[PDB]
Amino acid sequence: CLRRLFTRWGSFCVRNPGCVIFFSLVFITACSSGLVFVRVTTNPVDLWSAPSSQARLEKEYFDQHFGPFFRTEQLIIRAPLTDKHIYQPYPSGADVPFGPPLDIQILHQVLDLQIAIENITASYDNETVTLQDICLAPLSPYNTNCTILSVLNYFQNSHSVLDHKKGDDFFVYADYHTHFLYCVRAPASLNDTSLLHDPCLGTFGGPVFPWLVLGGYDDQNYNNATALVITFPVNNYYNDTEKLQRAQAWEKEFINFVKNYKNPNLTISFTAERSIEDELNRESDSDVFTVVISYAIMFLYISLALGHVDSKVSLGIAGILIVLSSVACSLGVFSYIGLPLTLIVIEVIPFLVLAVGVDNIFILVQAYQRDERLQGETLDQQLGRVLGEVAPSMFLSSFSETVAFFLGALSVMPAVHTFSLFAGLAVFIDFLLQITCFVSLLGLDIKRQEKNRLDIFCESCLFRFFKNSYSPLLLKDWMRPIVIAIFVGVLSFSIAVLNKVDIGLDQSLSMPDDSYMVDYFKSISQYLHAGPPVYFVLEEGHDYTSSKGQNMVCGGMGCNNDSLVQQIFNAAQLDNYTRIGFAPSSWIDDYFDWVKPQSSCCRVDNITDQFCNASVVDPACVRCRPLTPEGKQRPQGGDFMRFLPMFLSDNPNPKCGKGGHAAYSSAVNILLGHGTRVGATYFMTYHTVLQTSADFIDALKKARLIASNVTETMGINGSAYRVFPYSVFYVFYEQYLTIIDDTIFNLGVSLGAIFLVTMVLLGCELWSAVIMCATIAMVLVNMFGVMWLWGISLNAVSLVNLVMSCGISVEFCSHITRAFTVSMKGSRVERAEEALAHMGSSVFSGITLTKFGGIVVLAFAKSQIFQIFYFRMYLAMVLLGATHGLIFLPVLLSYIGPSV
Ligand SMILES: *[C@@H]1O[C@H](CO)[C@@H](O[C@@H]2O[C@H](CO)[C@@H](O)[C@H](O[C@H]3O[C@H](CO)[C@@H](O)[C@H](O)[C@@H]3O)[C@H]2NC(C)=O)[C@H](O)[C@H]1NC(C)=O
Ligand SMILES: *[C@@H]1O[C@H](CO)[C@@H](O[C@@H]2O[C@H](CO)[C@@H](O[C@H]3O[C@H](CO)[C@@H](O)[C@H](O)[C@@H]3O)[C@H](O)[C@H]2NC(C)=O)[C@H](O)[C@H]1NC(C)=O
Ligand SMILES: *[C@@H]1O[C@H](CO)[C@@H](O[C@@H]2O[C@H](CO)[C@@H](O)[C@H](O)[C@H]2NC(C)=O)[C@H](O)[C@H]1NC(C)=O
Ligand SMILES: *[C@@H]1O[C@H](CO)[C@@H](O)[C@H](O)[C@H]1NC(C)=O
Ligand SMILES: *[C@@H]1O[C@H](CO)[C@@H](O)[C@H](O)[C@H]1NC(C)=O
Ligand SMILES: *[C@@H]1O[C@H](CO)[C@@H](O)[C@H](O)[C@H]1NC(C)=O
Ligand SMILES: *[C@@H]1O[C@H](CO)[C@@H](O)[C@H](O)[C@H]1NC(C)=O
Ligand SMILES: *[C@@H]1O[C@H](CO)[C@@H](O)[C@H](O)[C@H]1NC(C)=O
Ligand SMILES: *[C@@H]1O[C@H](CO)[C@@H](O)[C@H](O)[C@H]1NC(C)=O
Ligand SMILES: *[C@@H]1O[C@H](CO)[C@@H](O)[C@H](O)[C@H]1NC(C)=O
Ligand SMILES: *[C@@H]1O[C@H](CO)[C@@H](O)[C@H](O)[C@H]1NC(C)=O
């Protein structure tokens, strides 16, 4: 039926070509109008996460009480030019060694450097920004000293306490070696036991646990350390753009300072939480020139290879501008609606629309070239008749592609969702502006060609032959079998080695050639002993103010054995398996060890009933919990809620402990209502060393396994609350937990669409379709085989290029399958030969441009992500699809093709 519409409308475009060029122009301008309007290129690195994914819902929950996870700037600083030294104690005998970085004159230099960094000036909003402004001080009143994780916080960042020495000039009863050896074993104390005194706390960045500052030490003896780790945590509050940016500026001066810092006594590594999203943007420039010159070669070929100085140069340029017009239109309307225009979309979309649109251009133009007008036939009748001969094919392919991509936007991997929207529309708009504006400006170049005026100013060429000779050899029953054998061999190969495909991005690979983050990843895998931290979160609803409520969560001292912190501790004994690193560091156990009557920590005034200090003189401040036998037991009743806010207001006092303001302040949520209640909580620990792309995934899986294992044991009946873990990266690496099923779903959905449209549209009869769909399945399976053979991973980028791949293979298989299915020659081999000579000779010119671009793409692409993912998968899709469409599909139709 469509033949009437495409014929009559083609005649229309030939008669009156003004209304269609002008109509289409109004369309284009109307969409590009929205282009520059929005053009919001998303870039926060949660674009790899789904807004409904359990990981991002968990993040949106953890942002309720601690808000965001802090930015982290780190330094692995090591001493290369200083040998070890030996500490011999005095009365007791137990010699200890001290590694290179633990020399004292070095620790002085580390202190001068850390003080220099501790105050760096930066300009934001035409103002001035200091570290103290933006780093988190766990006590906004009291001392606003900033958290700073170094071994030097054992010595309170002062050279006096470092050079402390107790003993006469000759012997040394207890120097800094003894203080260090004491703190690394109990870093939550305010009073050393060796000297008269000192404190193992610091400039109050909390109790400096020894694993976050030491590196390269063997096992438990930290003294054998070989590198110092220094961690500055800075606030993040993603919920704001004002101050996050000034933080980014402070880091921007920071990095330049550390890089331009000479100290031959030390070799340094470091990291700002923007360094990745910075050097990555740096690498996203090395290829741009190569991409543009690639498009110059494709454009140039398109201009040249058209027709037999009457070259259709202006026609090729025009069709190009129509394709670019289609891209700008799609990005336009979708921007208008509000679609974050990601970068991968900028790499894929113009390549796609350029390839397919160019193919349509060649089908049409070449179709007219091989046609010769009849006796008294007219231009309207001729170009209209050809437009009918071809149009339902271009509409078939482009339509199945559009519904395929659009239907592809159904998953939640956002990189493929945004893509499938943009492309799913851009293909359609390309077909509109292509069958309307392009053909109507094709009649113009026709009349110019027949009135002898030059194209730019004012038979059958070759590949018709080349395919009239290629088409017979390929399917003389002498050779048919051989071809089927080759393709079944390759397909069997890929079927075999598709399982051993690598899941996940190799973060060390994604960095520029000689960036600094590479040395940072290596120096992490070498020395470091702790990984990212995890916040085992207990949601609202737990009793807490009860025996069985505490024992379900409390740790040790009669607190079950399946309790939460007992679960994380037992899970930490096997660190290199259950990737849970170290001790859990609970609040409720410290609270219990704080209200304790034997402590003089908690005291309330006898007469104002207000909480007395731990350091105050207490004339009348009596103890919170009496020294009865029952009073020494944990606060079971509402007294729990009575004293808990005082603990979370209490501060480090040398007559008491670290108090709750230290770290459990921003950890315990006190819900106010019907008295009081305890909301959500967390138990901060640290993952083991995570380096491999499989490491992170294993850590997330096992951590959530601990979450569920605890949740069943908390005797809970229903989704009233769970115990999920949060970390920096669970958001980024939860997407790999379902990549298998999401890939299968998406490719099966695109295949279901293409098969449906090819079934119903291309008349009927399945076999016409099922042959095509099956051939596409071959294209994808062999594509996976290339991934394995060429070392290509299976992340969101490669997946996007797979969806696109199944997209463009339709441009090969579809026009051939149509040209075959609607034909009446004396043999099936005849129809396959013709369908391979007419359409095939044109599809092969919707190829050699993308191949002649795949050439130059490699020749200077520096980004190894580009060389590995985009170039290699592009090459595999073009050669693989082309061979599977112009070599295999004819032979297959020559035996199973339908008969008419
Ligand atoms: C890692 O740490 C352990 C312990 O801190 C180191 O073992 C110690 O090695 C040195 C010897 O070079 C000494 O500090 C100490 O041994 C002394 O005492 C005995 C007394 O009989 C004598 O036999 C010793 O070898 C030496 O005189 C060791 N201490 C212990 C507890 O074993 C170990 O060498 C360190 N390794 C590295 C690579 O630094
Ligand atoms: C899991 O944790 C450790 C992390 O890899 C792993 O390594 C052990 O600890 C250190 C390296 O961190 C090394 O142990 C060293 O101890 C002796 C002293 O007897 C030293 O002379 C040598 O350095 C020795 O290699 C080892 O590399 C290794 N082994 C031991 C015994 O400590 C642990 O092995 C892992 N443990 C478990 C239970 O999984
Ligand atoms: C953070 O606070 C502690 C105490 O609240 C500071 O320790 C004091 O340091 C200054 C020296 O510059 C003097 O007030 C005293 O020598 C210290 N007092 C005590 C009680 O130790 C610490 O210096 C502060 N942080 C920084 C970076 O100065
Ligand atoms: C550190 O370097 C300075 C100057 O290069 C030098 O004077 C000092 O001795 C070095 N430190 C040590 C422990 O040698
Ligand atoms: C930065 O502040 C530190 C103390 O916080 C001080 O020692 C240092 O001199 C300051 N830097 C400058 C350039 O004034
Ligand atoms: C920043 O603001 C001050 C006062 O508003 C002004 O004097 C100064 O010139 C500004 N900075 C620059 C670089 O102009
Ligand atoms: C540490 O404890 C000892 C023993 O009671 C005491 O003499 C000393 O003053 C304490 N240190 C501080 C800083 O109070
Ligand atoms: C807790 O104790 C029971 C027996 O009392 C034991 O079967 C169980 O395994 C223990 N918990 C763990 C985590 O092993
Ligand atoms: C309570 O203790 C804090 C910290 O130990 C101290 O700064 C404050 O002065 C004390 N309260 C009073 C009223 O002195
Ligand atoms: C507390 O007050 C009571 C009366 O309210 C008095 O009998 C008692 O001696 C006081 N004790 C202290 C330690 O102040
Ligand atoms: C985890 O759950 C299993 C049964 O689902 C239970 O037997 C076990 O005690 C729980 N705790 C562990 C394994 O620590």
Swiss-Prot record:
It is a multi-pass membrane protein. GO terms for biological process: adult walking behavior; autophagy; bile acid metabolic process; cellular response to low-density lipoprotein particle stimulus; cellular response to steroid hormone stimulus; cholesterol efflux; cholesterol homeostasis; cholesterol metabolic process. It is found in: Late endosome membrane; Lysosome membrane. It comes from the Eukaryota. The chain crosses the membrane at residues 18-38, 288-308, 313-334, 345-365, 390-410, 419-442, 478-498, 743-763, 770-790, 796-816, 840-860, 869-889. Residues 39-287, 335-344, 411-418, 499-742, 791-795, 861-868 are lumenal. Residues 287-444 form the SSD domain. One of its GO terms (cellular component) is membrane raft. Changing V595M: In NPC1; adult form. Changing G637W: In NPC1; found in the Nova Scotian clinical variant. Disulfide bonds join C135-C146, C183-C200, C554-C559, C601-C656, C602-C624, C612-C621. Changing Y173A: Loss of interaction with ebolavirus glycoprotein. Its main location: membrane. GO terms for molecular function: cholesterol binding; cholesterol transfer activity; signaling receptor activity; transmembrane signaling receptor activity; virus receptor activity. Glycans are attached at N119, N126, N145, N191, N224, N239, N265, N561, N576, N606, N613, N709, N717. It catalyses: cholesterol(in) = cholesterol(out). A cysteine-rich N-terminal domain and a C-terminal domain containing a di-leucine motif necessary for lysosomal targeting are critical for mobilization of cholesterol from lysosomes. Belongs to the patched family. Interacts (via the second lumenal domain) with NPC2. Interacts with TMEM97; the interaction may decrease NPC1 availability to the cell. Interacts with TIM1. Interacts with SLC38A9; this interaction inhibits cholesterol-mediated mTORC1 activation via its sterol transport activity. (Microbial infection) Interacts with ebolavirus glycoprotein. Intracellular cholesterol transporter which acts in concert with NPC2 and plays an important role in the egress of cholesterol from the endosomal/lysosomal compartment. Unesterified cholesterol that has been released from LDLs in the lumen of the late endosomes/lysosomes is transferred by NPC2 to the cholesterol-binding pocket in the N-terminal domain of NPC1. Cholesterol binds to NPC1 with the hydroxyl group buried in the binding pocket. Binds oxysterol with higher affinity than cholesterol. (Microbial infection) Acts as an endosomal entry receptor for ebolavirus. This is NPC intracellular cholesterol transporter 1. It comes from Homo sapiens. The gene is NPC1. The chain holds residues 334 to 1255 of 1278 of the full protein.
